[PDB]
Amino acid sequence: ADLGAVIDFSEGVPQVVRFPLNVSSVTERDAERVGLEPVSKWRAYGLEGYPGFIFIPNPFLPGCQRHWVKQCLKLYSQKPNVCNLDKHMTKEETQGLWEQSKEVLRSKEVTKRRPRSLLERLRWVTLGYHYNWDSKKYSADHYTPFPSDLAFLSEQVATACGFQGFQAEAGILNYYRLDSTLGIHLDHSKPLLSFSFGQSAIFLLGGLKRDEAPTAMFMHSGDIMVMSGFSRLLNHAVPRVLPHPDGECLPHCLETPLPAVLPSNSLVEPCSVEDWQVCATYLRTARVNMTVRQVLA
């Protein structure tokens, strides 16, 4: 029995299957409010043998991925949050993250023989309920507000996947660079939502039989994985970043600018030229992941 090829959901291996989305559960205007295409235009796939596994290739409107990258790099990394930098940086010091990256970016010396910027040292950010790894339950403290626009995005994707009533309550944002270390880390009826932006990576989905080789698949910028039940047990972080293709610094979906006119109720905001320079420079060698979970009931 041979080793399968890497599945590319964007074009020896378990059978790929269309997943039917509840296309009338999210209005066309609401999907655009957070930068998503209308659900009817989305593709979604399952895998035979893996109930609870959903894969949604890049369902984002052109240029709207930029809004979600900038939120992860520039806004969600700011207090109030819990952060890997809190080990060494004071809360006041972390407030200078964005201006520092712009300073590194404006320098004419291009070199890695220098201190790493805070953005380059960013590895994880948690929002909402804090998950205490010792206790292996959620904590009563280290609580930070869950950003509402990410909750609106999470709730819509969960609804279209058949999980109406889902509440975004615990988020973790992971930042992986080419030099990231390759480490590895209740009820699971409710889904967790996993978003990817930037460079590509390979998700290894655990074998069904014991000692079986995992099923491989590409995570492209904008891809969303919805996982619950049997398949939520199989979710894990992907710290390995694939280097960008020869000649192509960023995927084409990250090279489309945002619309000039957005709606006036939209949560997608404009992204300035200098702000996108920081995102584009960073994402040249990085992938950002967003994981959203429900906590209460």
Residue numbers in the entry: 38 to 48, 58 to 231, 237 to 348
What does the paper say about this structure?
AlkB family of 2-oxoglutarate (2OG or α-KG)-dependent oxygenases are evolutionarily conserved and implicated in nucleotide demethylation. Mouse ALKBH1 protein has 389 residues and consists of an N-terminal extension (NTE), a nucleotide-recognition lid (NRL), and a C-terminal double-stranded β helix (DSBH) domain. By establishing a reliable in vitro enzymatic assay, we demonstrated that ALKBH1 prefers bubbled and bulged DNAs, instead of ssDNA or dsDNA substrates. Structural studies of ALKBH1 in substrate-free and a 21-mer bulge DNA-bound state revealed the molecular determinants underlying the observed substrate preference, including unique features of a stretch-out Flip1 motif and a functionally indispensable N-terminal “α1” helix.
The extra α1 helix forms extensive hydrophobic contacts with the minor sheet involving residues F23, L26, F27, Y30 of α1, I230 of β(II), P290 of β(VII), and I253, L255 of β(IV), and sequence alignment shows that these residues are highly conserved in vertebrates. The α1 helix is critical to maintain the structural integrity of the active center; in particular, F23 and F27 directly stabilize the minor β sheet through extensive hydrophobic contacts. In support, the structure of an N-truncated ALKBH1 (residue 37–369, ALKBH1Δα1) determined at 2.3 Å by the Se-SAD method demonstrates that missing of α1 helix (residues 22–32) results in distortion of the co-factor coordination geometry as reflected by flipping away of H287 and disordering of β(II) that comprises H231 and D233. Neither Mn(II) nor NOG was observed in the crystal, and the impaired co-factor coordination of ALKBH1Δα1 in solution was also confirmed by calorimetric titration. Furthermore, enzymatic assays showed that ALKBH1Δα1 was totally inactive in N6-mA demethylation. Although an α1-truncated human ALKBH1 protein was reported to have demethylation activities towards m1rA in tRNA,8 we performed in vitro enzymatic assay using the α1-truncated human ALKBH1 and hardly detected any activities towards m1rA in tRNA stem loop nor N6-mA in DNA bubble, further underlying the importance of α1 helix.
